[PDB]
Structure formats: C-alpha cells, structure tokens
Amino acid sequence: MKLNISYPVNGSQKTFEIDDEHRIRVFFDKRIGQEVDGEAVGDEFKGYVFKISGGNDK
RNA sequence: UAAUUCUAGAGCUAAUACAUGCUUAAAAUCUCGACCCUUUGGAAGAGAUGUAUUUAUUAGAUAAAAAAUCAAUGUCUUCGGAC
C-alpha cells in the first residue's frame, strides 16, 4: 500500500511504500478527518502528527 | 485502475463570474404636533412620499329649462353674505 504524504508548509510532498501488516492497522476503522501518530508505524516518524484526506481502492 | 471524453490529495492568481455597497436640483403636499392666548385662532419643530410585489376602498362626468330653500363662504362688502 502506498502512502501519499504531503507537508503544506514547505509545500513538498513524497510518496511512501510499506509492506507489513501490523504497522497499518492504526489507520484502520477511521473516517477521514482525524489524526494518528507516526510512532505507531515509524521509527522515522517519532512525534509526527498526521491527518487522512482521501484514497483509492484496488 | 486491464480498462472510457474516469479522476484524488497538496500548492498559487483574475472577471461584464459570485457576494456586497455610497453619491444629487429645487419645489409642493400631507399628517403629527413645542408653544401662543385667544378669538372664528395660528404655530416652531418633526416625519412621510421613486419604481416593483399583494389586498381593500374612491375618480374614471355627459340627453332640455327656472325658482323656493338650509347655511357656509371667492369677492364690491351692499358684513346682507346675495353672488
């Protein structure tokens, strides 16, 4: 599953690709318009606050 | 996404698009009525009046002559009020 991630202060954006299962399910059962924490998924994402704003299925 | 004039997230800037919003003659006429001190009174001041919407109520005259009359008045006053 891809991850279209964007930073709207610098204006840059970057995609990301992750493969396992257990890091994903923090996202699960969430409507869009709320936040998560990247420490649940990423050691490179310590302290990071997100928000979910769209997707596309298979 | 195998795919069709399929489309998602993030970042910019316009209008005869979208949303708001000022300017201006003088006159007249109505209602309210500070006061006034009086007869038969007259008055400051105030506000109202574009067009469009809806309802109610008036004008939108007309076939041929002259008095008596109830008063009011325009007027020469003829202080009669006839006209």
Side-chain angles (χ1 to χ4, degrees):
Chain A
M1 287 176 58
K2 297 283 195 292
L3 265 191
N4 190 82
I5 319 164
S6 68
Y7 184 48
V9 187
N10 293 327
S12 91
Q13 58 211 19
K14 187 187 174 318
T15 176
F16 262 107
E17 169 63 51
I18 47 177
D19 61 77
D20 64 351
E21 45 93 20
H22 48 85
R23 290 178 173 180
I24 308 193
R25 275 94 42 87
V26 51
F27 289 128
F28 269 45
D29 304 60
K30 295 277 201 55
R31 71 171 63 152
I32 43 183
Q34 43 204 349
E35 307 96 313
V36 282
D37 174 35
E39 315 195 348
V41 58
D43 300 331
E44 67 273 17
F45 300 139
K46 290 328 193 212
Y48 281 78
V49 199
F50 280 172
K51 196 171 78 87
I52 45 178
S53 170
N56 273 294
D57 71 325
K58 292 177 183 179

